[PDB]
Structure formats: structure tokens, C-alpha cells
Curated annotation (Swiss-Prot):
Protein name, as recorded: NPC intracellular cholesterol transporter 1
Disulfide bonding pattern of the chain: C3-C52, C9-C20, C41-C87, C53-C91, C75-C216, C78-C138, C155-C162, C205-C221, C218-C225, C416-C427, C464-C481, C848-C853, C895-C950, C896-C918, C906-C915
SSD domain segment(s): 568-733
GO MF annotation terms: cholesterol binding; cholesterol transfer activity; signaling receptor activity; transmembrane signaling receptor activity; virus receptor activity
Effect of mutating G608R: Loss of function
Organism for this UniProt entry: Homo sapiens
Length: 1194
């Protein structure tokens, strides 16, 4: 061996210098540019160097290689062979093996008069196996600001016919502008002229160059990426013979029942052609004695009753109302609530978002044509220049807003979050205008001279949607697109309406204004909401006819529900008035026209209304005293429920007295005591059954059911007591009044056999209980039960969180805009808890996504999830901090540089006096920082800023994501890896997203193998607390309904004696009511949520109020046969139960039908209507027939 050239003495043109000929042996290097040889081509560095090379040649290599490093450095094995062809081509130590100079001539020096020899031309021997593996490993790499191939800008022609030999000829040719002299390549693998060429090792785009540099992407290499992922779809229908499972299995249960049931009637019809009274008797005696006591002592009883009312109802001064949604819809000690508590303590709370979905309806799409060559690229309507100026005008106006509070201004600049503050203090605005940095100048600046423009905002937009984190364009524009706050703006967060990667076609512009949320501070939250109100008002009062804005503020759902929570008081007041009107007119039997206003019950009706409203106030006041806060659900379900139960008892008592004839020699207090003693066990049964039912129903962890259960239980109990003591006293007084002839309301101016009872005794009970009507009735009811049980498991789960908004609202428009345009959803944070190591080889392999780290690690699993993206609802890649930290700390990048004496961070833009690199540029230094070096360089990384010489830095993105626990060697605390969900439109989507995020977290926790259960991975998103209840709502429904029905069963089997048969008939009928309630639920499209479960547990308690009365009247009766007992029970009790609860509630719902609110009209009106008429129908048409057939003897 020998060298061929050294130095630069000649000059061609510009800075280009001809190499100076010298064919002696290779020189030991002067120790000056040792750093350069390890960056350009490290294959020569095994020191005792003896390289023929020169630092003035090396620095011109590095200067000319600027654009191939930028384009081709994405795929390391490609840029590795390119470096191997140049370093070796220029200054290899065995240069004479593969080179032979042909033409050379002398050069004259103006400095020393010694004539130097330039090298004008020569020939270069290149192997064929190097060029084929080189071109084939580099042909797939894409270019920046285009979808072309990167060879298309470096071959000198189209990328369809640049062969594996002509491209090398174009590179060595001076026609490009870089090569100082043309070199003629000759390609041959075999020795010619006895001289054999160079053939070193080659690596393709799939093989990695070193054990720490990850392989090439499949965007830039066609041999790494194989079959796509695919999930397995389970649909799960049984579908036996063509239609559903329960739909067919029930219809065969029905045909089997109807044939085995009516074939026994037509089979036999053609064949024939003491402990109870001991507890039920002491109660009767007690109520009779106490009833007489109350009629002959009215003053003491009414006084003590009023004192009780006042003492209990004085607790309304401490009334608190809960309106904050997390405490309402999320259990205080649930799993999701504990995860939210852990996240708010270590990383601070999730921010508040104010979006704005602007759209341009008048403008049409236009075409953009690149000047040199390239296919046409169409741009959507909002991406016109005029529309962008108007949106920029709108954004600068939203930043203006001041919104004074407590005589001081509270600006956007004060409340929004600027991640890297105070250095840069602007704040996060996520708008497509941040690519141009919110400046009319930068947006309006074009580069060129007439008849065509070289660059334009189309070119800038196209460059920055592909790579939004660059700090200079470096190709004909030379502008950054980082954004005024500093840190990237991702195109899927700021655009919508495009088609899957093609951001050119965008139809909407999304503009987000993140605002800080504060953890245990209330003054700041009042400041933030004070700004949001004015933001809402401004956007509503913004005219701009070219644009259609769909906006939202963080407090807007709460504001819409508090604005919607009025406008129906005009319906509820008229509802109660019409109810009271019926109570006053229907209680009194008319029986004559000249005696109307004396046998009238107006005063007694007023007394009934005051006892019911008074009961409401006593319930509210006792639980207000105790400290239980109210809710807006309670305020709509409590008057109605208490009205239902209380009014029915009032009718039972008053009509049971009116239809009673007074015995001879019996005075009034004895008669009223007798009637109360004979009617009171049934009322006691109903009231006690509901109180025990509701109170026992206060065991769930659901806040709506918990507070409702407490309030409703106390109200039913207090209302029963208040009736039993005060209403019989007022009833005695009103009988005294009517017997002393005195007229009604004004003052002092001086048996019944009611119209309903003559219909129920004479026409309805005999007809219904005939032998040709009972099989028809039983057939119809088992058929309706069969339908309801069949369509049971097709009921929806959850609430749409939209139908809860008015129809004239802007939030409905915002939800339409989301569903029609948006592509990203709420962010997910995968929090790895405190306790992980991070300063060890295995501890880093379990968490990384990169080269040496595992294939089942955390970052890799979220990446796989994002490759699926429809089964698992995680839309995008993770954005880890540990990969970035490793990329930052590696010696090649050279962002890291420490001060020599102070051990302080020397910045990337600094004058360079003596600060040296942190990690040594040796083979050991290439590796990951596994020891104590990790924790010595991590805070400096998290404090580094986005410098143009370094890259992105770790302050704007990871400062809140990494917690460092100072003192005792400084370990790492809890950290997160944040990605984004897919657009979620319905409750099914939200539950699916929750479930599968939990699944990924549980998977990672399994693979990590923790000794015991010291820590675990968990996902946090904002809606998890609101949607975690629906993962156990089915077992909650089972437990609540089963426990309430068992409580009813037990209370019935205790109070009725020990008769198990009456209890089983009553319980089976209320279970029928619940199953048919679910059928009507499915049929009207009501969904199962936290409102519907409350309404079902209420229906289970009104079902008793019908049943209990009828079944007790049948049971305690001493007639002969079942038919006469059924018609007797029907007549006697059903005349009062149809007039008391049914007609009142029916009048209420039919007047309530003009409601004007959607939430009310779906979950309250329909459920109440269903409950009332279903229970009425069931009781009065199904207890007679079922008791007639299989009722309990005595
Ligand atoms: C979403 O945006 C993409 C942006 O590429 C649209 O694709 C392209 O469609 C436009 C429609 O008018 C074509 O002009 C583009 O190019 C054509 O380019 C070839 C190049 O060989 C020429 O020979 C043709 O004469 C023509 O000019 C076309 N570009 C590519 C790369 O396919 C896409 O249509 C759009 N989607 C919708 C729904 O509008
Ligand atoms: C994730 O989201 C969807 C499934 O959840 C996919 O989308 C869909 O788009 C429509 C339905 O809106 C359907 O495609 C129809 O039109 C195409 C035209 O080529 C037909 O081939 C197809 O038979 C349908 O009539 C599909 O149901 C679905 N995608 C397709 C192929 O259009 C979406 O693609 C999916 N993405 C991924 C990566 O899973
Ligand atoms: C081309 O291949 C040769 C043959 O392997 C390489 O030469 C050796 O390089 C290693 C790397 O450090 C040295 O340890 C050996 O001592 C070298 N052997 C010799 C000179 O006989 C050479 O490095 C390759 N070219 C490049 C640029 O890597
Ligand atoms: C956002 O921060 C940037 C710098 O972090 C501020 O800077 C400049 O904006 C002015 C016009 O206001 C331009 O003339 C300069 O070119 C920018 N300076 C640099 C060095 O980039 C900017 O004012 C801040 N505010 C807004 C609203 O953009
Ligand atoms: C547009 C494309 C083709 C440009 C990429 C090729 C460039 C960067 C390459 C091709 C030929 C190379 C040159 C070949 C010869 C010499 C003389 C030597 O003493 C110093 C390096 C120097 C000056 C090289 C610098 C890099 C170089 C100019
Ligand atoms: C280039 O690579 C392709 C696969 O991408 C292969 O089919 C072809 O044979 C290769 N050509 C060579 C090595 O000349
Ligand atoms: C609104 O913002 C503009 C931005 O240039 C500023 O000049 C002006 O002072 C702001 N305040 C007003 C109008 O109160
Ligand atoms: C606002 O508060 C300050 C006290 O900080 C007080 O001096 C000032 O008079 C107040 N202004 C008004 C208009 O109330
Ligand atoms: C980005 O602009 C040019 C592009 O060639 C580059 O030379 C320059 O160094 C970069 N800017 C800074 C501040 O480093
Ligand atoms: C609406 O668009 C037209 C055309 O781009 C423009 O002239 C006008 O100023 C725009 N703005 C309005 C009406 O506020
Ligand atoms: C994942 O785990 C190891 C690491 O390479 C290996 O044994 C296993 O085959 C890998 N699985 C796949 C599918 O690559
Ligand atoms: C770089 O460091 C110097 C000195 O510490 C400091 O003045 C300068 O603001 C830093 N620049 C950044 C962080 O962009
Ligand atoms: C760093 O400090 C050591 C000893 O303090 C010294 O030997 C070395 O030359 C210094 N390097 C630089 C670049 O100042
Ligand atoms: C979690 O792991 C199980 C087996 O360990 C696998 O079936 C399931 O698909 C994984 N879930 C993911 C990757 O979301």
C-alpha cells in the first residue's frame, strides 16, 4: 500500500480545491481533527492511525454532506454505506488498490514558489455488490415536504429510472455544483490489469449498524414491514334458526305454556262433560285504642305534631346543594376516583379546554400547483388565504379578552398554561395558525420574482404537517414551524374533515385554548370561570358572515344544565294545582245538589296537601342537619313519590269511613277508632314495606341512589306517622263540623255508597271474574311477560350526554361538529406508579420503546394498540420521555455538554470556552446511561430548552411528566406516557375505550412481574370517573332489585302472619311489574343509567301500594269460595285504590305531558307513566284472576 493524495493547494471555482498529488506512504495524523474522523467514518479509528487524510479535506466532506445527512440520515444503514463510499473514496489507507491517476499538471503558488501537482481527473474501481446493496437499501427513503422518493432530488431526474450506476456517476459529476472534479466510476467485481478493487461489508435497511441504533422504518424501507395487524371480531349472537336467541327461546316457552295450559282446561272440561291472629289482633287493638285517643284529645296531638314538624323542618337553614358533576356521578371511593386522586397529587390536574370549530361555508376549494414539477394538491375551503386572515383576526381578538372580577382583570395570558415558563411566556394555543406563528407578515410572505412563486404558505403548510417539530425548513424557505409557545403542534389536533393522512383536504379548523386547572385552590377557579363566561358571550356576539363557529368552554355543560333546570316550574306548579283540584272535588261524595257545599271535603284536602309538603320539608331538614347534601334528581323525584304514597292512604281512610254505617249506641270516637283499627294494618303494611325497601336500597355506592334512598325512606316513614297522628285528628274535627250542620270553608253560616263503588261492585268485578274471561286475562299477561323477558338483554347501557342538552343550544351544534369533523379524542395518561427502578439495564428494557428494549414493554404495547386503532380505541403513538432522553444524551447528537469545573449544564447555544461533552465518544459511551449517570444527566435534560442547534429539548413536553424526588441520591417518582384516544361519539364507545385501556395496563403489569403488588400501571382520562359506573351497573341492578324484593318479601311474611303463600303471590306480581318495566324501557328507548335504576327501585315500592291492599283484602276475608273472595276484595279495596293513587297520578302525568325538556320527557315522564298504568293494570286486572285461581285458603 501507499497513499495517493494530500492537501489542497489548487482552486477550481468558489471554494472548490483540486487535491494535491503525493504518492508516498500514509502520515500519522496531527491529533487535531480526531473528533471529525469518528463522525465521518469511524472504520479507520484504531489508534496508531497512519491515515493518508487531511482535516482540510474532512471539513469539506462535512460541509458538502449537509443535504445527504438531512435527507438520508433517517435510514442509518443507507447513510452508513454512503459514508463508507466517501470516506474510503477520499482518504482510505489502502487507496492505491482501487485507484489510478491518469492526467495531472503543475500549479503555481504565490507564497513560496514551489510548484504543486493538481489532480484534474482519474478513474475509480467500485464493486458491483456494494452498489446493488447500496441502491437497494436506499431506494425507498422519502423526502421532506413531499411524498416523493429522496433519490428524486439527488439523481438529477425522475425517481422511476435512476439506475444503480448512473446515480453514482451524477454524484461524482461537477454538474450538480458540489463535486470539485469529475471522477469516472468503473464497476467490476473481478481483477483487471492484475489490480483488484475494494469490496467491504454491506448492510441493508433491515440489518442494524450497531446494537443501540434501531432499524429503518417501513416508510423508508420496503423489506422490513410484512403483514398488517388484524383483530378477531366476536359478534356473539346465538341465532338458532335465523332470528335471535331469547326472541325464539321465549316464543317456544310461550307456545309450550299455552298448549300445556289450555289443554288441561279443555282436557278436564271435556272429561267432566293461630300464630297469625296473635300478632294481627294486638295491632288492631292498639290502633283502635290509639285512634279513639286521638279523636277525643285533638289539641295535645296536633300541638306535638306541629312542634315535631317545626323541630324537624328547621334544618333547612343548613341546606347545601351539590352541582359539581364528579361528586354527583362518581362514587367517592371508587377505583377511578382513587386513580384521579393519585394523578392530581403527583402530576397536577388535567387542564381545561375551550375549543372552537370554525368552518367556511361560502368559499370553494382551489388547486395548488407546484412550480418545478409535482402532482396537483387540492386545498379545502377554510385553508384559503382570506379565510386564514379572518380566523387569525378572530384568534387575536380572543386573546384580547379581559373579563373583570373583584375589580381586577383576569387575562388569558394570566390563566392559560405556558409549559416552559418563565423563559417563554406566551401560552399554548393549538391552532393551524401557530405553524405561521400568528403573524400576518409571516403568513403574507412569499419568496420569488414574477410569473410564479417559489415558496408560499401552501409549501410551508405541506412541509410542517409532515414534520411539525423542526426548527428550520432548510430547503428554499428556511422558517421554523414550532409555534409561539414553543413545542410542536400536531396536525390532527387542529384540523378535521380530512381523509386519513391527507391534511390538504381539511374542511374544518379546530382551535384549542388550554387553560390551567388548579388543585386545592378556589379563587383561581373562580378567576378561570369568570374568563370563560365572557369568552362564551363574545363568541355568541361575534358576527363574521364568512364563518360558522361551533364553540365550547369547560364549564359549559354545567351552565347548560343549570340554564335548562328552569322553564318547567310553570308546568310543575300547574301539575300540583290540578292534582289538588281533583283531591278537593273527588273526596266528597255529592249525593244531592242542595247539599253540595256541606258534604264537601275542601278543608280536608288542604290538610292533606300540607301534611305531604310538610313531610317533604321534615325529610329535607333532618338529613340537612345530619350533613347529607342534596341533588337535583331528588328535587324532581321526592314530591311526586311522597304524594303518590300519602294521597292513596288518605283516600283509603276517608272512603273507608264514608262507606261505613254507624252501629247503634256507638259514639264518634269509638266509630272512628273502629274504622281506623280495621283499615290501618294495610296502610301500615304499605308504608313499612316501602320504608324498609328504600332504606335497605341505601347500600349501593352510586350517589344518586344513595341520597334518593335516604330521602325517600325518611319521607315515606315521616308521612305515614304524620298522617296516623294529625290526619285522623283533623278527620275527627271535620266529621264534628259536618255533623253540627255548619257549612264548609268560609265560617259559621250553617253510609254513602259512592259512584265508583256501584260500578266496581256491580259491573266490573263479576264480569272480569267469569270463567270465559280469566283464561284470556292470564294468557295475555303471561304473553306480555314473555315479550318483556325476551327483549330484556337488548337494553342500552349509559347516557348519551347530549340529549341532556336543549334543542336550541350551542352544545348540541358542538356535538354535531365533533361527530362530523374531528379526528382525535381525549388524551390518555398511562401512569406508571412510584416504585420502579429506572437505573438498571432490565429496568430500562421493561419501559422503553427502542432498539434493545423488550418486545412486550409499555411503549411498544401502546404502539401495537395504535396499530389496531378500532378494536382498542387508542389512536396514536405514545410519545415517551425515556426514548427522547436517550436520543438527547447520546454523543453523536451533542445536545448534552457539561461544564468542566462546576458540573453545571453548558447550553447548546454558547460560545464554547472549555465545556466538554457529557458522555465520552467511545464504544462504551454509545450505550444507554445505565448507572448513576442516568440520574446525573436527567434533570439537565428536563431543564433543557428548544434550542435550534440541539433539537426539541425536554422542558416543553416532559417537565410535568417526570417527577424527581430530591434528596438521598434522587430517585425517579411516578411518570406518564401520554397518547390520545379516537373520536368518541356514544356511550358504547366511551365504555369500550375505558375497558380496553384497563386491559393494556393490566397486560403490562402482568409482564413486568412485580414481587407482590407494590405498584402497577393505570390509565387516566377525564371521562373515566363518569363512565366507570357502567362496568358494574348490571350487577348493581341485580343486587339492588333482588335485595329490595327480598326485603318486601320478608316484611310481608312478618306482617301478614306467617303465610308464605300470599307473600309469594304478591312478590311474583311485583317481579312481573319489574320485568315488564324493563320491556317498556326497551320499547320506548329509555336506557339503563343512574336515573333509571332510581326509577326502577321506586317502581318496586309503588307496585306494593297496589298489590298489598288487594291481597290483604283477599287474605283476611271469611267467605267460602275463591271467586267470591276475589270479587269482595276487588269491590272493597280496589274502589279506593283506583280512585286514590291511579286517577291522581294519571291526571298529574297527562297534565305534565307538555314538559319542554328532553331529560325530563324521557327519564321521568315515561318511567312514571309506565310505572303507574303498569302497576294499576297488573294489580286491578291480574291480582283478581291469579288469586281466584290459586289463592290461599282459610
Ligand atoms: C385528498 O388530497 C389528495 C392530495 O394528493 C388528493 O389526491 C389527488 O387528487 C387530485 C384531484 O384533482 C389530483 O389532481 C392529484 O393528482 C393527479 O396527479 C397525477 C400524477 O400522476 C396526474 O397525472 C393527474 O393528471 C392529476 O393531476 C391526486 N394526487 C395523487 C398523488 O393521487 C385527493 O383527491 C383528495 N381527496 C378528495 C376526496 O378530494
Ligand atoms: C376503523 O373505523 C371503521 C370501522 O369501525 C372503518 O371505516 C369504515 O368505513 C365504512 C363505514 O363507514 C366501511 O367501508 C364501506 O365502504 C367501502 C368502500 O371501499 C367498502 O369497501 C366497504 O364494504 C363498506 O361498504 C367500512 O366498514 C370501514 N372501512 C372501510 C373499508 O371503508 C375504518 O376503515 C377502520 N380503520 C381501521 C384502520 O381499522
Ligand atoms: C474494510 O474491511 C477491512 C477488513 O476487515 C477493515 O479493516 C480492519 O478494520 C478493523 C476495524 O477497527 C480493524 O480493527 C482491523 O485491524 C482492520 N484490519 C486491517 C487493516 O487489516 C476496514 O476497517 C473496512 N473499512 C471500513 C471503512 O470500515
Ligand atoms: C410569542 O413568543 C415569541 C418569542 O418566543 C415572541 O416573538 C416575536 O414576535 C414578534 C412580533 O410580535 C416578531 O417580530 C419576532 O420575530 C418574534 N421573535 C422571535 C425571536 O421569534 C412573540 O411576540 C410572542 N407572542 C405572540 C402573540 O406571538
Ligand atoms: C446533489 C448530490 C449529488 C450531492 C452529494 C454529493 C457530494 C456531497 C460529494 C460528491 C463528491 C464528493 C467530493 C469528492 C472529492 C473531494 C476532495 C477531497 O480532498 C475532499 C472531499 C471532497 C471535496 C468530496 C466532498 C463531498 C462530495 C462533493
Ligand atoms: C432489490 O430488492 C428487491 C426487493 O425489494 C428484490 O426483489 C431485487 O431482487 C433486488 N435487486 C438486486 C439485489 O439487484
Ligand atoms: C387588543 O390586542 C391588540 C393586539 O395588537 C392590542 O394592540 C390592544 O391594545 C388590545 N387591547 C384593547 C383593544 O383593549
Ligand atoms: C378596587 O379595590 C381597591 C383595593 O385594592 C380599592 O382601593 C378601589 O377603590 C376599588 N375600586 C372600586 C371601583 O371598587
Ligand atoms: C437554520 O437555518 C439555516 C438553514 O441552512 C442554518 O444554516 C442555521 O444554522 C439554522 N439556524 C440556527 C439558528 O442555527
Ligand atoms: C367576508 O369575505 C369577503 C370575501 O373574502 C371579504 O371581502 C369580507 O371582508 C369578509 N368579512 C366580513 C364580511 O366580515
Ligand atoms: C418477543 O420476545 C423475544 C425477544 O426477541 C423472542 O423470544 C420472541 O420470539 C419475540 N416474539 C416475536 C413475535 O418477535
Ligand atoms: C443558554 O444558556 C445561557 C447561559 O446559561 C442563557 O443566558 C441563555 O438564556 C440560554 N438559552 C436558552 C435556554 O435558549
Ligand atoms: C478539564 O479539567 C481537567 C482538570 O481539572 C483538565 O485536565 C482538563 O484539561 C480540562 N479540560 C478542559 C477542556 O478545560
Ligand atoms: C393482553 O394479553 C393477552 C394475553 O396475555 C392478549 O390476548 C391480549 O390481546 C392483550 N391485550 C392487548 C395487547 O391489548
Amino acid at each position: 500500500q501507499s497513499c495517493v493524495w494530500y492537501g489542497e493547494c489548487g482552486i477550481a471555482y468558489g471554494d472548490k480545491r483540486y487535491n494535491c498529488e503525493y504518492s508516498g506512504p500514509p502520515k500519522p495524523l496531527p491529533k487535531d481533527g480526531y473528533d471529525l474522523v469518528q463522525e465521518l467514518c469511524p472504520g479507520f479509528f484504531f489508534g496508531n492511525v497512519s491515515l493518508c487524510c487531511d482535516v482540510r479535506q474532512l471539513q469539506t466532506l462535512k460541509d458538502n454532506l449537509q443535504l445527504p445527512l438531512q435527507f438520508l440520515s433517517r435510514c442509518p444503514s443507507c447513510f452508513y454505506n454512503l459514508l463508507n463510499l466517501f470516506c474510503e473514496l477520499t482518504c482510505s489507507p489502502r487507496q492505491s488498490q482501487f485507484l489510478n491517476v491518469t492526467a495531472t499538471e503543475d500549479y503555481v503558488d504565490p507564497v513560496t514558489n514551489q510548484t504543486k501537482t493538481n489532480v484534474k481527473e482519474l478513474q475509480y474501481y467500485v464493486g458491483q455488490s456494494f452498489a446493488n446493496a447500496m441502491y437497494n437499501a436506499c431506494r425507498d427513503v422519502e423526502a421532506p415536504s413531499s411524498n416523493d422518493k429522496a433519490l428524486g432530488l439527488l439523481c438529477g431526474k425522475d425517481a422511476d429510472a435512476c439506475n444503480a450506476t448512473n446515480w453514482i456517476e451524477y454524484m461524482f459529476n461537477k454538474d450538480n455544483g458540489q463535486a470539485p472534479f469529475t471522477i469516472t466510476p468503473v464497476f467490476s467485481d473481478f481483477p483487471v490489469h492484475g489490480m483488484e478493487p475494494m469490496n467491504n461489508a454491506t448492510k441493508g435497511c433491515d440489518e442494524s449498524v450497531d446494537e443501540v441504533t434501531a432499524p429503518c422504518s417501513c416508510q423508508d424501507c420496503s423489506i422490513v414491514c410484512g403483514p398488517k395487524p388484524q383483530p378477531p371480531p366476536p359478534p356473539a349472537p346465538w341465532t338458532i334458526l335465523g332470528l335471535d336467541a331469547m326472541y325464539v327461546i321465549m316464543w317456544i316457552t310461550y307456545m309450550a305454556f299455552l298448549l300445556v295450559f289450555f289443554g288441561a282446561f279443555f282436557a278436564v272440561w271435556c272429561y267432566r262433560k293461630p300464630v297469625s291472629a296473635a300478632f294481627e289482633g294486638c295491632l288492631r287493638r292498639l290502633f283502635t285504642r290509639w285512634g279513639s285517643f286521638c279523636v277525643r284529645n285533638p289539641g295535645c296531638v296536633i300541638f306535638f305534631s306541629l312542634v315535631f314538624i317545626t323541630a324537624c323542618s328547621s334544618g333547612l337553614v343548613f341546606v347545601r346543594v351539590t352541582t359539581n358533576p364528579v361528586d354527583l356521578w362518581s362514587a367517592p371511593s371508587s377505583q377511578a376516583r382513587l386513580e384521579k386522586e393519585y394523578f392530581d397529587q403527583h402530576f397536577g390536574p388535567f387542564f381545561r379546554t375551550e375549543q372552537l370549530i370554525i368552518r367556511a361555508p361560502l368559499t370553494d376549494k382551489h388547486i395548488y400547483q407546484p412550480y418545478p414539477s409535482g402532482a396537483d394538491v387540492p386545498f379545502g375551503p377554510p385553508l384559503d388565504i382570506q379565510i386564514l386572515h379572518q380566523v387569525l383576526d378572530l384568534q387575536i381578538a380572543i386573546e384580547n379578552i379581559t373579563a373583570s372580577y373583584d375589580n381586577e382583570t383576569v387575562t388569558l395570558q394570566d390563566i392559560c398554561l405556558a409549559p416552559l415558563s418563565p423563559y417563554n411566556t406566551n401560552c399554548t394555543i393549538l391552532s393551524v395558525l401557530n405553524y405561521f406563528q400568528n403573524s400576518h407578515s409571516v403568513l403574507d410572505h412569499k419568496k420569488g420574482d414574477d410569473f410564479f412563486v417559489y415558496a408560499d404558505y401552501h409549501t410551508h403548510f405541506l412541509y410542517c404537517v409532515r414534520a411539525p417539530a423542526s426548527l428550520n425548513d432548510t430547503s428554499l424557505l428556511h422558517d421554523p414551524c414550532l409555534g409561539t409557545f414553543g413545542g410542536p403542534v400536531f396536525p390532527w389536533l387542529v384540523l378535521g374533515g380530512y381523509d386519513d393522512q391527507n391534511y390538504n383536504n381539511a374542511t374544518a379548523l379546530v382551535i384549542t385554548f388550554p387553560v390551567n386547572n388548579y388543585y386545592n385552590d378556589t379563587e383561581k377557579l373562580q378567576r378561570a370561570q369568570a374568563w370563560e363566561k365572557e369568552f362564551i358571550n363574545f363568541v355568541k356576539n361575534y358576527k363574521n358572515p364568512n364563518l360558522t363557529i361551533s364553540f365550547t368552554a369547560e364549564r359549559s355543560i354545567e351552565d347548560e344544565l343549570n340554564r335548562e333546570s328552569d322553564s318547567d316550574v310553570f308546568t310543575v306548579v300547574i301539575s300540583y294545582a290540578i292534582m289538588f283540584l281533583y283531591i278537593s272535588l273527588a273526596l266528597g261524595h255529592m249525593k244531592s245538589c242542595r247539599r253540595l257545599l256541606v258534604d264537601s271535603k275542601v278543608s280536608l284536602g288542604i290538610a292533606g296537601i300540607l301534611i305531604v309538603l310538610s313531610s317533604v320539608a321534615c325529610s329535607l331538614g333532618v338529613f340537612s342537619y345530619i350533613g347529607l347534601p342534596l341533588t337535583l334528581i331528588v328535587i324532581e323525584v321526592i314530591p311526586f313519590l311522597v304524594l303518590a304514597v300519602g294521597v292513596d292512604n288518605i283516600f283509603i281512610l276517608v272512603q273507608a269511613y264514608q262507606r261505613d254505617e254507624r252501629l247503634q249506641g256507638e259514639t264518634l270516637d269509638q266509630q272512628l277508632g273502629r274504622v281506623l283499627g280495621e283499615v290501618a294494618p294495610s296502610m301500615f303494611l304499605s308504608s313499612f314495606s316501602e320504608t324498609v325497601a328504600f332504606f335497605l336500597g341505601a347500600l349501593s355506592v352510586m350517589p344518586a341512589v344513595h341520597t334518593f334512598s335516604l330521602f325517600a325512606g325518611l319521607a315515606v316513614f315521616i308521612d305515614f306517622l304524620l298522617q296516623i297522628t294529625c290526619f285522623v285528628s283533623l278527620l275527627g274535627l271535620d266529621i264534628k263540623r259536618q255533623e253540627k250542620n255548619r257549612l264548609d270553608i268560609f265560617c259559621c253560616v250553617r253510609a254513602s255508597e259512592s259512584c265508583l263503588f256501584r260500578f266496581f261492585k256491580n259491573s266490573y268485578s263479576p264480569l272480569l271474574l267469569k270463567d270465559w274471561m280469566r283464561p284470556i286475562v292470564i294468557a295475555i299477561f303471561v304473553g306480555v311477560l314473555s315479550f318483556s323477558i325476551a327483549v330484556l338483554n337488548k337494553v342500552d347501557i349509559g347516557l348519551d350526554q347530549s340529549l341532556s342538552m336543549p334543542d336550541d343550544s350551542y352544545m348540541v351544534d358542538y356535538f354535531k361538529s365533533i361527530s362530523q369533523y374531528l379526528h382525535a379524542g381525549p388524551p390518555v395518561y398511562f401512569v406508571l406508579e412510584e416504585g420502579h427502578d429506572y437505573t438498571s439495564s432490565k429496568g430500562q428494557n421493561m419501559v422503553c420503546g427502542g432498539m434493545g428494549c423488550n418486545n412486550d414493554s409499555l411503549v411498544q404495547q401502546i404502539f401495537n394498540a395504535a396499530q389496531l386503532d378500532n378494536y382498542t380505541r387508542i389512536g396514536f403513538a405514545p410519545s415517551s420521555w425515556i426514548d427522547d432522553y436517550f436520543d438527547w444524551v447520546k454523543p453523536q447528537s451533542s445536545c448534552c455538554r457539561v461544564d468542566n469545573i462546576t458540573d453545571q449544564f453548558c447550553n447548546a447555544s454558547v460560545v464554547d470556552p472549555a465545556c466538554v461533552r457529557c458522555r465520552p465518544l467511545t464504544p462504551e459511551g454509545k450505550q444507554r446511561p445505565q448507572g448513576g449517570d442516568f440520574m446525573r444527566f436527567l434533570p439537565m435534560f428536563l431543564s433543557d430548552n428548544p434550542n435550534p442547534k440541539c433539537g426539541k429539548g425536554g422542558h416543553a413536553a416532559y417537565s410535568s411528566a417526570v417527577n424527581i424526588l430530591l434528596g438521598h441520591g434522587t430517585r425517579v417518582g411516578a411518570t406518564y406516557f401520554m397518547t390520545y384516544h379516537t373520536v368518541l361519539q356514544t356511550s358504547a364507545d366511551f365504555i369500550d375505550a375505558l375497558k380496553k385501556a384497563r386491559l393494556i395496563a393490566s397486560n403490562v403489569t402482568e409482564t413486568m412481574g412485580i414481587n407482590g403488588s407494590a405498584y402497577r400501571v393505570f390509565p387516566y382520562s377525564v371521562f373515566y370517573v363518569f363512565y366507570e359506573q357502567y362496568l358494574t351497573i348490571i350487577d348493581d341492578t341485580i343486587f339492588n332489585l333482588g335485595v329490595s324484593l327480598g326485603a318486601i318479601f320478608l316484611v310481608t311474611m312478618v306482617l301478614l302472619g306467617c303465610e308464605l303463600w300470599s307473600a309469594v303471590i304478591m312478590c311474583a306480581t311485583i317481579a312481573m311489574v319489574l320485568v315488564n318495566m324493563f320491556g317498556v324501557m326497551w320499547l320506548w328507548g329509555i336506557s339503563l343509567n343512574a336515573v333509571s335504576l332510581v326509577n326502577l327501585v321506586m317502581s318496586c315500592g309503588i307496585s306494593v301500594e297496589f298489590c298489598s291492599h288487594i291481597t290483604r283484602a283477599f287474605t283476611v276475608s271469611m267467605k267460602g269460595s275463591r271467586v267470591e273472595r276475589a270479587e269482595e276484595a276487588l269491590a272493597h279495596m280496589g274502589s279506593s285504590v283506583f280512585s286514590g293513587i291511579t286517577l291522581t297520578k294519571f291526571g298529574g302525568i297527562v297534565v305534565l305531558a307538555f314538559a319542554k325538556s328532553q331529560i325530563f320527557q324521557i327519564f321521568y315522564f315515561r318511567m312514571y307513566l309506565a310505572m303507574v298504568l303498569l302497576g294499576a293494570t297488573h294489580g286491578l286486572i291480574f291480582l283478581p284472576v291469579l288469586l281466584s285461581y290459586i289463592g290461599p285458603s282459610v
